[PDB]
Amino acid sequence: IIGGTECKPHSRPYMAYLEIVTSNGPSKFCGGFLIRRNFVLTAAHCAGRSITVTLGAHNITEEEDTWQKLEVIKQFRHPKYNTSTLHHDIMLLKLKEKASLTLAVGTLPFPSQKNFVPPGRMCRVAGWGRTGVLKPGSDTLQEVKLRLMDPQACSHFRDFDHNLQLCVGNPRKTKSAFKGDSGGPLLCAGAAQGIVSYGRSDAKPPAVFTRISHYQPWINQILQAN
């Protein structure tokens, strides 16, 4: 998170920290969120050989009683996820066991929206991603308020599709989601509207978020069969 502020410890109980193991390299990380006691929603580009989830965390270097590190048994990437276009950047992770509900761990209902969130609306996103282009991932959970933009604002991302994605981040400001924040939910009015997906390597806003509403049926499908 760039230009954000550290969250009050455990104020975002649904936030998941993911450690991803790849085959030919060191581990990677992303965010994500608990939607069911045994299901975490995240970005497809965060897939790997195996993933371990940490719930109840604030400062990920110091373990505390709130921590619940859960094994992921299956990764359900969207069947249409395209690496080149980054379309359908959404993935579901089935946990080995159901998480315990505590003051630090809880689910975020994949909602019920009467109408789509209009541009101009200020939403917020949290993550442990880099806080700068050459800066490392944050130790603590950071949170920033971003403005939902008109799709024209993201035209420069040649594969950006208004129907599948959200354009977030006022280009006149520096605040933005960045590397490592992928999979984190974008909440507007207290409801998750998108998932951090991609942006510019130089961190200039806006960034592109996966529009959740569009995948609601696929998500349900997977939940119902597992």
Partner: peptide
């Protein structure tokens, strides 16, 4: 475009 860089995946986050």
């Amino acid at each position: 475009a860089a995946p986050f």
